[PDB]
Amino acid sequence: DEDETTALVCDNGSGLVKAGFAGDDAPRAVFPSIVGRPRHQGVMVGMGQKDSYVGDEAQSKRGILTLKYPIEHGIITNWDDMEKIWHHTFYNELRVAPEEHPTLLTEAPLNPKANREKMTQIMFETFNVPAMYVAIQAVLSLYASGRTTGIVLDSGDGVTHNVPIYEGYALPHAIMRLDLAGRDLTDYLMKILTERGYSFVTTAEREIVRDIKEKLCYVALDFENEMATAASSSSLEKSYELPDGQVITIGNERFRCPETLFQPSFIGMESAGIHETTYNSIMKCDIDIRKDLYANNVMSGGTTMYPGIADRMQKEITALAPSTMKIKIIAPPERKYSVWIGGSILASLSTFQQMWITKQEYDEAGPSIVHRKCF
Amino acid sequence: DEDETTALVCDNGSGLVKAGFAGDDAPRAVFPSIVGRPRHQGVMVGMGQKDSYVGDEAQSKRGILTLKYPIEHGIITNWDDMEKIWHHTFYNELRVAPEEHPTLLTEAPLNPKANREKMTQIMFETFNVPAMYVAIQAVLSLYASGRTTGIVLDSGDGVTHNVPIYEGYALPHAIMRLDLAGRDLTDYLMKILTERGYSFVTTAEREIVRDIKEKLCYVALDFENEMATAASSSSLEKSYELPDGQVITIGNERFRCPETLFQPSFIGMESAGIHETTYNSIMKCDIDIRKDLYANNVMSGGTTMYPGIADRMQKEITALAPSTMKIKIIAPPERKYSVWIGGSILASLSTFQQMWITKQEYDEAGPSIVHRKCF
Amino acid sequence: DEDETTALVCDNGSGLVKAGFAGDDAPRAVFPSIVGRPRHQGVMVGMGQKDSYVGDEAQSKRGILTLKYPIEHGIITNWDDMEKIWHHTFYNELRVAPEEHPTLLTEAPLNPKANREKMTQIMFETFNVPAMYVAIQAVLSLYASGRTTGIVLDSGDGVTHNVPIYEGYALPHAIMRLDLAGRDLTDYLMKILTERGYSFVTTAEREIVRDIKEKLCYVALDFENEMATAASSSSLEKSYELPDGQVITIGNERFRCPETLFQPSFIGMESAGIHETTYNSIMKCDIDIRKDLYANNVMSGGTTMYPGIADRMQKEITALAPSTMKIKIIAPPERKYSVWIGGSILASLSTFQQMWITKQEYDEAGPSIVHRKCF
Amino acid sequence: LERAEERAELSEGKCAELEEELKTVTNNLKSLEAQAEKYSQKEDRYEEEIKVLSD
Numbered sequence A, B, C: 001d002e003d004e005t006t007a008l009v010c011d012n013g014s015g016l017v018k019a020g021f022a023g024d025d026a027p028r029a030v031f032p033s034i035v036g037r038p039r040h041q042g043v044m045v046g047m048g049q050k051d052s053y054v055g056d057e058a059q060s061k062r063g064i065l066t067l068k069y070p071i072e073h074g075i076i077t078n079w080d081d082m083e084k085i086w087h088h089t090f091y092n093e094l095r096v097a098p099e100e101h102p103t104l105l106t107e108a109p110l111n112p113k114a115n116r117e118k119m120t121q122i123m124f125e126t127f128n129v130p131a132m133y134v135a136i137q138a139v140l141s142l143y144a145s146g147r148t149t150g151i152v153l154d155s156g157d158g159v160t161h162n163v164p165i166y167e168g169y170a171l172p173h174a175i176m177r178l179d180l181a182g183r184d185l186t187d188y189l190m191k192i193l194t195e196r197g198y199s200f201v202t203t204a205e206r207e208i209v210r211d212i213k214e215k216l217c218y219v220a221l222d223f224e225n226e227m228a229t230a231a232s233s234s235s236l237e238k239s240y241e242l243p244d245g246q247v248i249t250i251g252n253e254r255f256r257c258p259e260t261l262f263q264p265s266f267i268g269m270e271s272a273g274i275h276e277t278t279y280n281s282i283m284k285c286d287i288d289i290r291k292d293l294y295a296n297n298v299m300s301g302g303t304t305m306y307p308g309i310a311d312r313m314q315k316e317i318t319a320l321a322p323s324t325m326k327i328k329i330i331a332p333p334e335r336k337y338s339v340w341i342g343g344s345i346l347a348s349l350s351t352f353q354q355m356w357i358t359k360q361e362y363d364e365a366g367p368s369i370v371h372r373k374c375f
Numbered sequence D: 001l002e003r004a005e006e007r008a009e010l011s012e013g014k015c016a017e018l019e020e021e022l023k024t025v026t027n028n029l030k031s032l033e034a035q036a037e038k039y040s041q042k043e044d045r046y047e048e049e050i051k052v053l054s055d
């Protein structure tokens, strides 16, 4: 429905796919990366009923569906489900025909090449796109934020990439790939809500807990002060309405879940924590780089929206940092959306028009071309 | 009448309560976790007749009683009824007053905290026990089975816990708790027996179906091959004599009911089964742990009392496991009783003498102390 | 268990520790420079379990331990862990109390002096050694190799030192120190194995990649030719088996890891590589020295075990070198162990018996004495 | 009613969001009040370092 062959932009995460067209400042819609399937035997005749539901269909009919995500910590492992998600995104909601538009996809720079090669392959081979580019999420948040330098901290649903960029350059020896994200925080919360008497196991229950976290949780500027207080008084509880009319109240679990980002040991992970990985990405860079990365701690993705996180991360790095150095977090409202936004900006740059893989180059070069043309 | 001031041990599950003294062989008595109450109007007078019946009393007079279980899915919800079960257990069969004897009770680590707090509180406030401890059923299973390392698959009456333990340490993020247990297998059997022409709806009928399951059902090492014959010939049926002289038989339903453990969807549960949970508990553990857990899958609890289960599980995990690796199962004759057995072992260890909560510690701290000192 | 009060010899690097007695041919025990600590909460009672594990204990029980290396690029920063490594080495494996035997420790001359002062201090103040001598690894390398003159090429796990020696004298202005070593080569391998779909981040996983490197990696005489071949054919792929039965197949990563020694930009290092520095160490020496250093380029320490390394280094130095001149590399089987051997040789020389610091000269002078008595 | 209640919920949603933003901003206000004052004090500590260094 577009009146120009603008590039399409789709940010495919473990959570939701943000999608819209290049040149806008937002996706048209967010398409949860979900393909649902009925888990019950039909009794009534003439009910329609499909073998699978996609995106918002999968969540709307979830009462009898088992819901699964095709993306594991940033890598697509279930390609059948992503073709359904992508098809639905273009076909029904973005009202897009990729055959007439270049498409820009996003990815962590640290993920296996198999994902960037396959995403390049599907847009050219299944959706017949005239051109492709797969972009780096550190880059995309920095474009959206108006920055060329900084440590980009995603703390997303899937992966935390911890990548320092200076003057537009990667500083790869200082990268901390971290296997800790919102999907793990959610599982932790289900176990501690079980301690409170509310057992969340099945899909409807998993989606409820993800909704509880998104509306009730925070990290706390100072964990121990909130911990001691929340564990001692009901004044720190917050309620949530369960869909059947029942309610749940949450106390110190409200922050114990988000806290895993700073304390990965909460879920059995061996990790420095997001504030130390951010710190180490600054620390491992050259001495004349360190000052610029300290002043540019850059947020990306979701969870960066938790109360106390922008103030806490700045304090946690300051506590590890040398004196003299001025430490600052860049936490724009373009939060949870900056990677998609960066894609819109990048796709549209005049300086990026030659970075696109064309269909002819793809067909001659093969799928490995993404390694030579994108990153 | 005892020759030592030892601890008392009671495995109070959602099914039955195994009770005896620490340091002894087994439980002195096993009670149903049942409190029974009459559902009829009396006509004769001077007939005795209780307001409520407990344990074996509840079953012996069940012809006119409705039978309720104070414990469900691993948690006591009716503390008053458990105090009644315990008064009877301790004073009438064990012939002991807990006032002079430390008492060990059990739970799963993922049961709501209320379970451990009420177990501790009843014994300290209504029995005046000098000390308390709430134990981990998986730990007790490992002591009884001769292991410090393995996956404990307790397959109980109300819940399956599925927890990896390595060198005496928990790997808690890898616990795959499942909402499928022996009580659900009984209800499934009642529905399939109804399809066969034998409907059961009231308590007397429900207790009998559980008894039918316990004596007639098996799981089969290979359910497809078992079904090929069981569904083709009457030679695979087994008869059960009902209390009223009627005879009920079961054909391939004899193994299809237990099969739920490998097919939870049979009762409407969103799960692939116990072997999937066993496998994922191993998967969530570090690579240098996994080799020992594959070699040490531990069956404990009841419902493991189905012929073909040790072999069924070895095949089902081997099928998911990497090649080269040896997958092994521990399934001792001390099945269903192994938790009690472990209780006696733990309660009496010299290394466990300081793990006990004393009455003085309880009175000063209140019941929340169990959450901090036991585990 | 030793029949003489000979010197103890221990080469303690950032990777492995080689320990034995002077006058012998080989270390009696080899330990990793590792102290391990449990990162999990204990669940079972009476399980023993140590607070910390050392050397081979640390690796043997590693499934639930985080493993730390006390040495950072050649300098010991964690002396709590090193006194454990030394105590274990002496007390349990060499079966010696250092109080009865002199001890020789080793380090590069550009290693901060603080480390040789502390090595002298640990043996005198914790182990009460009667005497000390901190040796130059290059000195020990030339004794073990049968040389007085030559270039010592010693890239290790920590750093690369690169030092020319002529007639037993050092030419220190020609030392080319680089922050380029096996730990960084390993980090590069972890990133490129991630590119292939095998992401390794935890201690167990990091140890696996280090083990993959040691068993599978090589350099090849010609990098462009090996690269072009690996990119064209499966004939250069090699498999590795992992502890849980997983198998990884590795292609050009097998030599791209080692390649970093010639291409330091792979790990963010500002360097032209080890052949440029080996060449410069010869070049910075007087022309009447250079002829003997060119003909006696001597490998010691590990990484020298990569097939194709002796030939690539000889070829690159030859390409950089003037024509007519004969360039030769000595790469003896006593590789990775030759420094220990040199330690044994030096400690036992009659001409070296006056070089030992006694626990008297040390106590009167203090720790700084190592700078005047050793190097 | 459902729509009005929905508006109450949407408006309460906004109310809570604004409240969270209010508190975030207010908490930032307070940390900034503390910083503006600490900074005014630093404006003086630094000015003093200049005066001392000048002397």
Ligand SMILES: Nc1ncnc2c1ncn2[C@@H]1O[C@H](COP(=O)(O)OP(=O)(O)O)[C@@H](O)[C@H]1O
Pocket (backbone or CB within 6 Å): A011, A012, A013, A014, A015, A016, A017, A018, A156, A157, A182, A183, A210, A213, A214, A215, A217, A300, A301, A302, A303, A304, A305, A306, A336, A337
């Ligand atoms: N307000 C919030 N409170 C708590 N967590 C949040 C909040 N906003 C975003 N996050 C978390 O971040 C993730 C969604 O952010 P997003 O980066 O847009 O996902 P994606 O990478 O698919 O685009 C979810 O896990 C969500 O729980």
Ligand SMILES: Nc1ncnc2c1ncn2[C@@H]1O[C@H](COP(=O)(O)OP(=O)(O)O)[C@@H](O)[C@H]1O
Pocket (backbone or CB within 6 Å): B011, B012, B013, B014, B015, B016, B137, B154, B155, B156, B157, B158, B182, B183, B210, B213, B214, B215, B217, B300, B301, B302, B303, B304, B305, B306, B336, B337, B339
């Ligand atoms: N032969 C059998 N067939 C089927 N189920 C059995 C058999 N024997 C024991 N069980 C089951 O054991 C359960 C109670 O045992 P138990 O494992 O000790 O509970 P828990 O461990 O949680 O305290 C009951 O549901 C009972 O049906």
Ligand SMILES: Nc1ncnc2c1ncn2[C@@H]1O[C@H](COP(=O)(O)OP(=O)(O)O)[C@@H](O)[C@H]1O
Pocket (backbone or CB within 6 Å): C012, C013, C014, C015, C016, C155, C156, C157, C158, C182, C213, C214, C215, C217, C300, C301, C302, C303, C304, C305, C306, C336, C337, C339
């Ligand atoms: N087969 C090999 N492949 C790659 N590197 C090797 C090999 N053998 C030895 N090295 C390296 O050398 C180390 C052992 O030799 P050494 O230099 O004496 O220890 P260090 O450098 O810590 O002082 C090992 O950690 C390994 O990283």
